[PDB]
Amino acid sequence: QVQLVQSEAEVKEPGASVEVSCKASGYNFTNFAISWVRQAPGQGLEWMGWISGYNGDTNSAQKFLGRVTMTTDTSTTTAYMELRSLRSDDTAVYYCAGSDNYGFPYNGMDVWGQGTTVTVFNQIKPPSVFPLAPSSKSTSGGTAALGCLVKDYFPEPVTVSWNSGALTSGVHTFPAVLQSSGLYSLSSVVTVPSSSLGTQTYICNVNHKPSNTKVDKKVEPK
Amino acid sequence: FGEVFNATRFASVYAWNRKVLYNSTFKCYGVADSFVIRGDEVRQIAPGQTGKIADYNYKLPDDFTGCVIAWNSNNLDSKVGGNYNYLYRLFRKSNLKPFERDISTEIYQAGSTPCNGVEGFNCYFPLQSYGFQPTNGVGYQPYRVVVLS
Amino acid sequence: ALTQPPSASGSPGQSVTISCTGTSSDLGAYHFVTWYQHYPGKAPKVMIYGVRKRPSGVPDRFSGSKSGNTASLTVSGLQDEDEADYYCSSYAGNNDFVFGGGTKLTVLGQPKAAPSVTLFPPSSEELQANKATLVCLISDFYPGAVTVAWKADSSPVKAGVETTTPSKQSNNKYAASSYLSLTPEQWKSHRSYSCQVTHEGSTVEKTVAPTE
Ligand SMILES: *[C@@H]1O[C@H](CO)[C@@H](O)[C@H](O)[C@H]1NC(C)=O
Ligand SMILES: *[C@@H]1O[C@H](CO)[C@@H](O)[C@H](O)[C@H]1NC(C)=O
């Protein structure tokens, strides 16, 4: 039952504050309980708190205790959620949800907003490229995995090749992880014959245009 | 007294029953009513107390002259999957006056939408089952209560 | 938080049950268990409220129940429209809620595939830069949902862990990665570390040791 309308996406920087609006769209919040629920990238739903549009009873999750303020103006029938001193792990989609209830919505929330994306952006950061050396126990007949760790850069994207593109078979570049710091890290591994570990050179080529950085990392045996 | 204390089945607190044992709680006030509640809710079976049990289920007056008895019946009133046959009143539009009983099951209208006798998203069944389990913490285990008036 | 499996799955037509474990102060204490269907992008949708009740318009193939501190949601006759994330939630007793971590429900379009796991210790270069990172790579699993846990001498590590959401490979199987960030002193002060990947009830564990 999506019917509430929320404010446009927000782009903030660490330490700023954000306020999301949620307009009743035709209802009157005097008979509505309002909850706020966020979802950070790659995580689950997270209840932030609730306010009663009837009498103003408020409660906040212990995680956000002291950091969030929820208000309602039933004059305009608009709910508001302020989140202060944003961190990079506050980057999430924020939903307002409601229910026809003069007290706590014990069953949860019936009416939902469309969500409001709030991104706490980082400064551009060049990556650090480290070798993931193949096993010290690699012998001729076997296969060996070796790779490149591309750690703590911002923003996307990053391109990784191997031996300037000459090597394509057996390459697997894993999509990056958005860390709680707001920075990305990814890994790229190629599987090679172990017999080639002593005769063949393996070099990963990392390009990060936003920071105008290029790294060529030779990965040598342990 | 044997028909009460030594009874096989006990009543729920919302539907409590009316009818030298000193040799868990034998608190007397100024000096028989049967039901089962969890151990943490036994403190509400006293004059001048508030809470879901004291206000919605069993109310004692501040002028109470009697004795409140209780003992842990987890061994009797708990099933491993939960004993849902014992319930208490979660919702009520007012508190009970002393020694009043409420056995109604009208749907509690929590919002502007009328219920018309049907449970809904904001239309609550007013009774909440306990679901007593033998491995619950002792504060959550069932206690048989006998109040001598 | 409540506990949910990461992945529940079945073929079209089968029945799937997602369990959700709470405590005696939430799931055990109340009949306010609500299940939310979610597709990232759209808003959550109530499928079951109370414990077993269906809002109007929800197909009757959705059912719910609870026993002790464990609630459950069963979908009968699985259809492709049911593939989604599902969150259990409960009233927590003090005008609040507790959510589970979510469960991805997959309509199996191909047979299940257990994951391959490769674990890399920190490079000496990174330790020279006063940092340490264990790299855990998970590939070729289906359906695309896993749980990753890190341990240091049996002790669970929950600080410094970053795990991707699974992403589809060219062969329709899924890949993911997890990273554990340590200080060099932290890395050296334990005798072994392990990455544990749980997928559809089966676990793969890889271990690295600073002195081996
Ligand atoms: C909402 O209801 C309140 C209470 O009756 C009223 O004062 C207010 O003007 C109403 N607002 C709208 C937009 O209907
Ligand atoms: C309950 O039964 C026991 C033995 O059967 C007896 O000793 C005890 O007095 C009884 N309780 C009451 C209140 O009569």
Numbering used by the authors:
A (entry chain H): 1 to 52, 52A, 53 to 82, 82A, 82B, 82C, 83 to 100, 100A, ...
B (entry chain A): 338 to 356, 367 to 370, 375 to 382, 397 to 514
C (entry chain L): 3 to 9, 11 to 27, 27A, 27B, 27C, 28 to 95, 95A, 96 to 106, ...
Paper lines:
CV07-250 (IC50 = 3.5 ng/mL) had 33 SHMs (17/16 on the heavy and light chain, respectively) and strongly reduced ACE2 binding and showed no binding to murine tissue. The binding mode of CV07-250 to the RBD is unusual in that it is dominated by the light chain, whereas in CV07-270, the heavy chain dominates, as found frequently in other antibodies. Upon interaction with the RBD, CV07-250 has a buried surface area (BSA) of 399 Å2 and 559 Å2 on the heavy and light chains, respectively, compared with 714 Å2 and 111 Å2 in CV07-270. CV07-250 uses CDR H1, H3, L1, and L3 and framework region 3 (LFR3) for RBD interaction, whereas CV07-270 interacts with CDR H1, H3, L1, and L2. The epitope of CV07-250 completely overlaps with the ACE2 binding site with a similar angle of approach as ACE2. Although CV07-250 and CV07-270 contact 25 epitope residues, only seven residues are shared (G446/G447/E484/G485/Q493/S494/Q498). CV07-250 clearly belongs to this category of antibodies because its epitope lies within the ACE2 binding site, and it approaches the RBD from a similar angle as ACE2. Interestingly, CV07-250 was isolated 19 days after symptom onset but had already acquired 33 SHMs, the highest number among all S1+ MBCs. Some non-germline amino acids are not directly involved in RBD binding, including all five SHMs on CDR H2.
